[PDB]
Design a protein around this nucleic acid. Sequence first.
RNA 1: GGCUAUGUAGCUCAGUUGGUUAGAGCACCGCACUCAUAAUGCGGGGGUCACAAGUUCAAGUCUCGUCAUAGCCACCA
RNA 2: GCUGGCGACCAUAGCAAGAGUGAACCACCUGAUCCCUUCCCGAACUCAGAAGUGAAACCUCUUAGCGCUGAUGGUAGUGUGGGAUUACCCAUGUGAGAGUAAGUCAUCGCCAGCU
RNA 3: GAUGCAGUGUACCCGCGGCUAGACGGAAAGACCCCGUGAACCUUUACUGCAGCUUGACACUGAACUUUGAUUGAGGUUCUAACUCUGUCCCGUGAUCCGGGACGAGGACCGUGUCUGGUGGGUAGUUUGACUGGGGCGGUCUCCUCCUAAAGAGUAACGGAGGAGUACGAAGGUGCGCUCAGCGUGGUCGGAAAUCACGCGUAGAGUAUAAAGGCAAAAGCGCGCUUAACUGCGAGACCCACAAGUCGAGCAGGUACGAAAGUAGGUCUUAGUGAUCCGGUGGUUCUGUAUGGAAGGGCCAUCGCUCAACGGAUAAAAGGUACUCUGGGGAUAACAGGCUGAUACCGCCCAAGAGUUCAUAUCGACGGCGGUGUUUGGCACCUCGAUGUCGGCUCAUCUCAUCCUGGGGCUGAAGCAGGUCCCAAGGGUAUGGCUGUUCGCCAUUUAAAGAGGUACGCGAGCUGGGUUUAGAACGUCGUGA
RNA 4: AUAGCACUCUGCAAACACGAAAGUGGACGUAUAGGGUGUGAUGCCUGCCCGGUGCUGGAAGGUUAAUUGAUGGGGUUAGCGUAAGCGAAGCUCUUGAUCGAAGCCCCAGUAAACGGCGGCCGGUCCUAAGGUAGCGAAAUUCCUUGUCGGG
RNA 5: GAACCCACUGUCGUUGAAAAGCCAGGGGAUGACUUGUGGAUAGGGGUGAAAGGCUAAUCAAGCCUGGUGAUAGCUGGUUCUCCCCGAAAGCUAUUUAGGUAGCGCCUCGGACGAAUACCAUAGGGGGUAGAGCACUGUUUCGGCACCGAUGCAAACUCCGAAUACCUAUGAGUACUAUCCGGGAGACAGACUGCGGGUGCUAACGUCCGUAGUCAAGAG
RNA 6: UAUAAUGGGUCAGCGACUUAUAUUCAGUAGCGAGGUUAACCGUAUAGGGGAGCCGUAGAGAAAUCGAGUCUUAAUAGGGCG
Lengths: 51, 76
Amino acid sequence: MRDKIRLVSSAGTGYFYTTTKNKRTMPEKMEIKKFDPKIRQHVIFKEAKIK
Amino acid sequence: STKNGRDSNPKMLGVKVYGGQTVTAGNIIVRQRGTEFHAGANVGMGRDHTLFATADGVVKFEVKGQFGRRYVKVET
RNA sequence: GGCUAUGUAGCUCAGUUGGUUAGAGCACCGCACUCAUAAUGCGGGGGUCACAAGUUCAAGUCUCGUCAUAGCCACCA
RNA sequence: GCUGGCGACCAUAGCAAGAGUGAACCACCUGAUCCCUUCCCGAACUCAGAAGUGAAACCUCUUAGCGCUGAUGGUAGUGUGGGAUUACCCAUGUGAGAGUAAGUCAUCGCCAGCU
RNA sequence: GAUGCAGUGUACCCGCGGCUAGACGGAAAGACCCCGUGAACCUUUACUGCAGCUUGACACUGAACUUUGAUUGAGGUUCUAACUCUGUCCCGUGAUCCGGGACGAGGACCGUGUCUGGUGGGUAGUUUGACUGGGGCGGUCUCCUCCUAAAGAGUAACGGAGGAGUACGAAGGUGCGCUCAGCGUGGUCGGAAAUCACGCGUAGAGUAUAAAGGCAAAAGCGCGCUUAACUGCGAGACCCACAAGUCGAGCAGGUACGAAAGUAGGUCUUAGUGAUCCGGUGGUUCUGUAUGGAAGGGCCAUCGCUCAACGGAUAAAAGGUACUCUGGGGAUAACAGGCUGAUACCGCCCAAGAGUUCAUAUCGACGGCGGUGUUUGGCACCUCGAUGUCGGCUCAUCUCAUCCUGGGGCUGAAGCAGGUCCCAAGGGUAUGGCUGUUCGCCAUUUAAAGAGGUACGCGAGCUGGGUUUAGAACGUCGUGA
RNA sequence: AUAGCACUCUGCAAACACGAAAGUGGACGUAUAGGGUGUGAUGCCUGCCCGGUGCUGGAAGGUUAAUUGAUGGGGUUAGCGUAAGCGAAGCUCUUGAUCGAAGCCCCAGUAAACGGCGGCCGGUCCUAAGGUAGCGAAAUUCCUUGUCGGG
RNA sequence: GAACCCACUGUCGUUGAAAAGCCAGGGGAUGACUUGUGGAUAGGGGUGAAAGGCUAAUCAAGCCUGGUGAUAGCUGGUUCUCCCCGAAAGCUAUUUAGGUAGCGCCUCGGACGAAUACCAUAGGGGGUAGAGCACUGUUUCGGCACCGAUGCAAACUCCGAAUACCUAUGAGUACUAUCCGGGAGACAGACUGCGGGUGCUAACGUCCGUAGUCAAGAG
RNA sequence: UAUAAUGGGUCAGCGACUUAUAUUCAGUAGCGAGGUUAACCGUAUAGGGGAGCCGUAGAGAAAUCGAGUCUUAAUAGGGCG
């Protein structure tokens, strides 16, 4: 079953998204470009524990 | 005992505006599961195949094209 | 959720913190002993030590995670 | 009047068979240098062209051969009022589907080139 | 299920002695059955407390030596002075209570207070769902697709059929590009069916998954680059008790892919879900109980429920009652009545055949049409402020589909007898053994020992053997009641 | 209910019961006694099972409470600082190393303790083990008015 | 086997002579016997050779007085007159099903009037009745999976009405629509005709859609 | 429901929508951008007593602003006014 995780901005603003992933077929950490509204630019978001 | 006895809630599909009526932009014209009708001039299509008006005017139905599709349009 | 302990052939018990440089007893199969048998004696096959990674001249033997199972304890959306 | 492009319309317009056109156009055609291309191939997409041909393909004409369109009349159903209860009948309004007679080898617009 | 309604028959007015067929007669707001988010008592490995029992720490509680484990701990042996004696002696005292005194035996134990873990039907408070052709047992409870559904929407049954409680960083976006399935031919292994080449009619393929509505600008299938599976919104509509749900052009910012006009706010769509409360995590120009901070709270983002009885009564819950009780219901079951007639019983139609030939003397397969209201049933209309009995006894009354007796037709009717059908309801129509029996079997009779209705006639006329209260036992079931 | 039988508990300030306690019964008794439980004169006797639950005896391994409080992380302010920020001590909020009993898990015994004494088609499987003597259509037998004999 | 103590069978009695008896029979009758007087044990307690027995004609928890006017979604009852209007027995949810809440339906006040309805014209979508075999299934007889004749279908469709439904304009007739507030009741329905599911093309059966009547309506 | 469903033998007397406080709506009276006192004092239904309450302004969780305010980077859009 897919697990929930957070994609946290690398700009230090603390902004994040939440999504799911299959840990069997994607063992590595997710990394994707997304829009950060606190700074109003596209930056890289990286996977972290949903906690 | 029986193995039947289930059904789903109604979905209320169908034609909402008939030919010759006036509409304003945004009004929903047809609710449909598939494309029984197709979008003509000044008519838009939603993600669930809903047909809606994108201009003010009068609704018209017709049959057009080489496949004989049913079209709905809005005349200004 | 916390703390412990196990998982070694065909079956079951060892080897347990380095240089492991995995054995023992029964299941078999063949041989020997006997007028014919057994017990016993000999030989062979039968695992690759739950795994995944890490330090290391030495890893089943140690550290990390993941499996399963067993025991005690804790759970006022 | 022939040719090309773009539309209107979507079988009375289509499919199938038979025949015809190289002046121009169109098509087949030559080559793989350069631009570009094939999970291999200049087959397709692309460039440089003019020795050939109207064979193929496309367009045009003929044919009711399949297909398609299709009356009039009757029948089935049916709203209202009445009479009956295997679900029919009367008055009044409405009226198919199938089948028959018959029809069909389309009809228009804009631009450009030729005789 | 009528003294009182309709039609009709009969009937002068009023007592007395008898009788019990009816007045659904009198008596007791049915005890059987169901319901109420009623009661009581009983049980237990239902839930949650408590008494009782027990464990350790601290206190009452002191002095000496010693032994042993990882500076501390645990252990042992002596001592008397706290403390104990339901042991002896003396006094108060004429006293087997009690107090004081002297001894003796124990002794830092036992025992008590506070805290703490275990056990705890001994005792206490409670819970133990609803739908339902009665209730129980079984099944079901939320979402999606089709039919029932009567050509707009909507529409029920314990009606007829199927699916869901997911998947995917590509199976999302964009630019460019491509057509399936089947068959017939030829061609190493290679065939019915692998891969290659060429023709023919064709959407019959595919669309992550069930079905339906769709799918050529393909919504089907490939390749390159990518993150719009964005942030702030949002004119206007659909649907709707509420709470919710659905579609959406367009504006601003940042972005991807295209030469460009442009396309993109997840996937052809419709299932893949859970309110509030209480808390956790990241931010924040809010608040901060004298003031400055802080704790705590607020706002934005997000996490924890098979709360599946899926609008979710608590954080936390099973059973018995024949020892029973109260409020209600003929809204709802068991008896008798009613409606119906599947079943049952009786009658008829056709007639393969059987009967030495011969369908019809007598039987009559395969099929068809009725009648009655006796059986087993279906429904739930009357009665739960009571219509109170399975057989026997006593006493009956009616029907005819006739058991005997009476009158006939036919016969595979010699006579005697029998078989079958028609007419006929005047009278008649067994006693015992077994069992509570109705029934049945048996013995022995008779001209015969008929079939049915009457609240399965008759208990305000009798009984009370059976069933169905309270006692007790066996088999079986349950941990137990 | 009973005489008879058996198991078990109790060493005396007895076990046990009443009571909040003081105290009282047991008993002015002392294991040939007293309490609880089951069976029920007498004759012949009383089979197998300790896997479950209970009771009795062990073990010092795992887990675990109160108490104790080692470390670590925040709040506050002297001071340092242009600033941001840094920041002792003292108070204070929180975290929880070590010590820690019984119980349970583990090992034996016990049925005149509560309980159990098979299933499937000669075998098989599974058990803790698969009914000994005696009796049997019985106060127990559905089928069932079983079958035979007697009356 | 008398007294005395019991209570096995039967008749009678049952508004009794009697709120447990009389009569005729029956059991024990020197013992675990019967009886007088005075004492002890008190309600989740006592006592019981054990029946849930007894504890003042009361016992699966005595009686009396207080909490107390306990609570009851249940049953009953609710008292003078006239005038106007006038329902529902549905949907949704509910430890909900004979209770309740929002909406639908009634009444009163205010605002506002033609925005409403009936009918006639004009515009519009459909997949039912019927029909058919072009798809999906199913059927019969010929010929060589296909061809020719022939049937059937709630979950088949190459087709396809009448009605119903939505919109615009218009004559005539009508106190019509709509909005804002006060007060409700009701959420057990029944039969008949038409279209159906279920049942047996049974039921005064049962469950829906639609119209009429009863409910709440006399002649 | 004539019902064979409930209740009443008859008469006379008694027998069931109340009271206090709060709140909302409708009438009616006074005053009117204002209206009104409570406890209390008081030879006491008068007269004093203005503390307090309702109306006159909204938006936002709040700090804050105010005919505006919240949301937002936004004077755009939108919600409440």
